[PDB]
Amino acid sequence: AMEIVYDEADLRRYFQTAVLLDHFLDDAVEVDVDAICDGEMVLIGGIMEHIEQAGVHSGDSACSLPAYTLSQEIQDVMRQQVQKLAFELQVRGLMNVQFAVKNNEVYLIEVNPRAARTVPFVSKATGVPLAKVAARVMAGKSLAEQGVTKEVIPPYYSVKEVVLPFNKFPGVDPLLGPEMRSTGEVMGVGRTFAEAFAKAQLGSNSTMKKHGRALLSVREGDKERVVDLAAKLLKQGFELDATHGTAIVLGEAGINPRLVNKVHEGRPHIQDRIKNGEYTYIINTTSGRRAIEDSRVIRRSALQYKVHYDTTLNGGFATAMALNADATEKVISVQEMHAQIK
Amino acid sequence: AMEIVYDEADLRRYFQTAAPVLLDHFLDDAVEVDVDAICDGEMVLIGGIMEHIEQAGVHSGDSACSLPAYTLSQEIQDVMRQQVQKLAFELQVRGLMNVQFAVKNNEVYLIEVNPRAARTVPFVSKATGVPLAKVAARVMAGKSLAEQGVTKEVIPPYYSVKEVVLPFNKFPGVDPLLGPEMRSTGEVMGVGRTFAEAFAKAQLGSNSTMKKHGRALLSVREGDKERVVDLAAKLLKQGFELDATHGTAIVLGEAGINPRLVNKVHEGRPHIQDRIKNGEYTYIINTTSGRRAIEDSRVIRRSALQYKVHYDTTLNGGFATAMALNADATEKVISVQEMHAQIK
Ligand SMILES: Nc1ncnc2c1ncn2[C@@H]1O[C@H](COP(=O)(O)OP(=O)(O)O)[C@@H](O)[C@H]1O
Ligand SMILES: Nc1ncnc2c1ncn2[C@@H]1O[C@H](COP(=O)(O)OP(=O)(O)O)[C@@H](O)[C@H]1O
Ligand SMILES: NC(=O)CC[C@H](N)C(=O)O
Ligand SMILES: NC(=O)CC[C@H](N)C(=O)O
Ligand SMILES: NCCC[C@H](N)C(=O)O
Ligand SMILES: NCCC[C@H](N)C(=O)O
Ligand SMILES: [Cl-]
Ligand SMILES: [Cl-]
Ligand SMILES: [Cl-]
Ligand SMILES: [K+]
Ligand SMILES: [K+]
Ligand SMILES: [K+]
Ligand SMILES: [Mn+2]
Ligand SMILES: [Mn+2]
Ligand SMILES: [Mn+2]
Ligand SMILES: [Mn+2]
Numbered sequence: 001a002m003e004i005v006y007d008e009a010d011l012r013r014y015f016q017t018a019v020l021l022d023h024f025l026d027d028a029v030e031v032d033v034d035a036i037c038d039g040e041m042v043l044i045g046g047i048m049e050h051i052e053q054a055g056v057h058s059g060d061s062a063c064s065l066p067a068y069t070l071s072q073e074i075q076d077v078m079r080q081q082v083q084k085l086a087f088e089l090q091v092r093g094l095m096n097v098q099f100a101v102k103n104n105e106v107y108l109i110e111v112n113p114r115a116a117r118t119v120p121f122v123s124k125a126t127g128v129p130l131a132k133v134a135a136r137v138m139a140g141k142s143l144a145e146q147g148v149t150k151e152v153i154p155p156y157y158s159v160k161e162v163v164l165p166f167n168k169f170p171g172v173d174p175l176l177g178p179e180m181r182s183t184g185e186v187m188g189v190g191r192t193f194a195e196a197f198a199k200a201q202l203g204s205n206s207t208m209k210k211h212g213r214a215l216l217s218v219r220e221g222d223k224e225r226v227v228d229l230a231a232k233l234l235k236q237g238f239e240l241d242a243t244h245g246t247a248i249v250l251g252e253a254g255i256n257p258r259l260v261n262k263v264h265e266g267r268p269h270i271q272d273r274i275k276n277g278e279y280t281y282i283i284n285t286t287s288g289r290r291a292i293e294d295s296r297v298i299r300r301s302a303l304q305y306k307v308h309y310d311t312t313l314n315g316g317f318a319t320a321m322a323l324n325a326d327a328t329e330k331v332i333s334v335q336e337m338h339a340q341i342k
Numbered sequence: 343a344m345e346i347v348y349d350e351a352d353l354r355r356y357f358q359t360a361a362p363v364l365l366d367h368f369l370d371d372a373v374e375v376d377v378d379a380i381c382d383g384e385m386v387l388i389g390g391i392m393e394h395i396e397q398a399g400v401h402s403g404d405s406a407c408s409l410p411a412y413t414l415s416q417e418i419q420d421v422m423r424q425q426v427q428k429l430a431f432e433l434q435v436r437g438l439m440n441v442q443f444a445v446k447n448n449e450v451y452l453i454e455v456n457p458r459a460a461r462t463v464p465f466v467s468k469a470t471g472v473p474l475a476k477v478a479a480r481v482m483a484g485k486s487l488a489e490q491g492v493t494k495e496v497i498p499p500y501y502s503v504k505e506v507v508l509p510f511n512k513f514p515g516v517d518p519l520l521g522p523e524m525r526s527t528g529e530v531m532g533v534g535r536t537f538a539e540a541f542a543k544a545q546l547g548s549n550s551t552m553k554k555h556g557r558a559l560l561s562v563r564e565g566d567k568e569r570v571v572d573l574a575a576k577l578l579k580q581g582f583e584l585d586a587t588h589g590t591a592i593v594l595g596e597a598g599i600n601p602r603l604v605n606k607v608h609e610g611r612p613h614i615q616d617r618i619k620n621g622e623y624t625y626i627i628n629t630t631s632g633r634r635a636i637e638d639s640r641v642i643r644r645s646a647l648q649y650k651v652h653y654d655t656t657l658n659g660g661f662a663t664a665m666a667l668n669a670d671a672t673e674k675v676i677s678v679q680e681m682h683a684q685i686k
Contacts, residue, residue: 241595244588244603245610247591247603248603248604248605248610251602251603251604256601256602256603257600258596258600259588259591259592259595259603260592260595261592265588266589266592
């Protein structure tokens with residue numbers, strides 16, 4: 001039962017309703033690294049950059065392999081940091097390490113000295129059967145011995161996206177957080193991150209379209225960044241609707257969305273519009289226990305009415321890119337993927 | 343000291359803050375009309391029919407008006423005419439009289455009859471070329487309209503529009519807003535070949551700072567919400583960029599117009615006030631209804647006045663303002679002599 005408390009007043013609130021205390025790394029890029037250690041060397045299985053930031057459980061995050069935004073430099077740091085930890089803990093077989101990158105700085109989230117849920121993904125993207133190799137390693141065959149020494153960076157992009165069970169429990173707020181709730185995953189393969197992301201998205205049963213009206217209702221910390229997102233969408237032919245505060249900031253950057261009322265504001269409001277099919281896409285980011293609680297209708301509504309929605313700006317940007325891709329254009333077999341590897 | 347109460351809750355509100363009290367039904371969304379005439383007991387001469395720009399509810403003394411009428415139908419004017427004639431005799435008018443009417447849903451309501459010379463007489467004299475005070479003085483003294491040879495109503499070939507000037511800038515603590523009470527100190531006159539030109543001249547004469555470019559702030563009430571769309575449309579066609587407050591922006595977006603959203607003061611920064619003060623606006627159309635809303639919207643009008651931005655507090659006025667945008671007050675001048683010479 002992990003929560004993110006914003007302030008002091010916010011803690012009692014928890015405390016009461018409600019121990020490990022940790023500083024939340026806000027606006028950070030979460031990373032998952034899968035590796036093998038035989039006591040002799042460390043094999044980097046895959047470095048995966050999640051789309052959703054730290055604070056959204058890795059299990060519920062879409063992710064990319066290779067990393068789509070992280071610097072070689074930043075990643076080399078991680079690589080070294082994992083090797084250091086492999087030896088230190090005396091890993092023999094599989095291991096997974098979770099990082100957060102904030103302001104060009106690498107921080108340690110956790111070390112899982114065992115097989116992690118991303119293994120099959122990495123194995124498929126990299127064509128290397130990590131569970132088999134690590135098994136052998138555990139049984140006594142060194143990496144050296146196996147001819148498995150080099151880290152594989154495929155020529156193509158591999159993206160993993162999850163599927164969430166919210167539709168099965170309507171009374172639940174379909175919102176991402178530090179706790180994992182997904183049931184499954186899909187893989188998208190493309191020549192570009194945008195292609196891979198498009199394939200992941202469509203495979204995950206997303207109802208996203210390449211036309212219509214998008215609803216933008218983001219929080220403070222996203223208002224600035226949301227400008228670029230609106231630009232993108234307008235550029236893809238989307239019309240824009242926005243809730244008061246968000247419209248304000250857009251307006252201040254030269255973008256004039258059509259305003260929509262919050263439910264308490266009047267009619268029609270967001271719910272009538274969602275219900276009435278005015279939107280093909282919704283971006284709704286929130287912060288604060290309170291805020292979340294009051295915005296619940298947007299998310300429940302979008303779910304109920306099958307409108308594609310993103311609860312993170314990063315997801316938004318990923319979706320925006322995918323719009324320039326065509327998930328049906330080309331196909332490729334796993335064998336083909338694998339042969340293409342140096 | 344009178345106002346328009348909108349409901350029971352409001353009546354208390356008032357009745358408290360304030361002796362038999364008069365209670366009249368307020369004809370909302372009505373066109374106010376002024377009619378000046380002369381009766382000699384044998385006949386009735388119509389001096390002029392003026393159509394106010396601001397609706398009934400904005401005192402006639404403070405309304406802009408036009409001679410001849412700019413929206414009313416002849417049919418409706420003919421009623422007013424018969425009505426004036428009937429009143430004239432019944433009342434035994436001998437000399438000048440003035441009749442004020444409200445038109446709503448194609449129906450003519452009587453607001454008041456003033457059986458003496460009215461403040462609009464000079465304007466009508468000047469527009470029609472007929473010196474009403476002289477004519478009526480001769481009538482009171484014994485010379486009939488027939489004896490005088492002044493028996494037929496004169497409809498000029500040009501439009502004449504009267505605009506007023508208000509003293510709000512002399513008393514900054516007052517809310518420079520129109521209502522049932524007259525607060526104006528003077529009037530101007532504008533003459534044109536079209537109502538738009540007459541209006542532009544009257545507007546310019548009245549010391550208006552209106553411009554034909556920039557950004558306009560739109561913040562109107564409920565009853566105006568639907569109709570303000572076409573005005574924002576006229577404003578965009580003229581080249582202006584629009585700003586709007588919450589609910590106004592909502593109505594407009596649904597009509598396809600997307601103004602830039604601005605925050606009220608309680609709402610956030612920068613707000614309407616900050617914007618006005620920084621010279622962001624060149625035009626402001628701001629309509630309100632009910633004691634509270636009025637009280638609450640105060641800052642817009644005071645700021646507008648303070649910062650010299652032209653502002654309209656009525657939609658009818660806003661529309662007048664927009665039409666004038668299509669006219670050039672400085673393009674042509676005409677002398678009164680010439681004007682009267684045109685008279686047929
Ligand atoms: N200090 C932190 N700052 C930001 N996000 C964090 C932090 N600690 C954990 N998280 C988020 O919570 C998720 C779960 O954290 P983790 O420690 O790995 O728990 P679990 O045992 O469920 O794996 C992480 O994947 C990340 O999204
Ligand atoms: N029943 C009414 N409906 C609408 N407006 C009215 C009504 N009665 C008065 N008014 C408005 O108030 C103004 C002042 O009212 P009026 O009766 O003419 O008083 P005054 O003697 O001060 O001129 C009118 O010019 C008109 O705009
Ligand atoms: N950032 C948000 O989701 C805003 C809150 C929400 N729209 C409400 O009605 O309270
Ligand atoms: N019609 C209006 O002017 C609405 C009221 C005003 N904007 C306020 O700040 O309350
Ligand atoms: N990877 C999580 C699912 C994404 C979902 N559309 C959301 O942003 O909430
Ligand atoms: N005719 C009265 C003056 C109009 C002023 N601009 C206002 O509309 O408040
Ligand atoms: Cl795991
Ligand atoms: Cl008078
Ligand atoms: Cl004062
Ligand atoms: K994450
Ligand atoms: K009037
Ligand atoms: K009277
Ligand atoms: Mn974890
Ligand atoms: Mn764990
Ligand atoms: Mn009167
Ligand atoms: Mn009177």
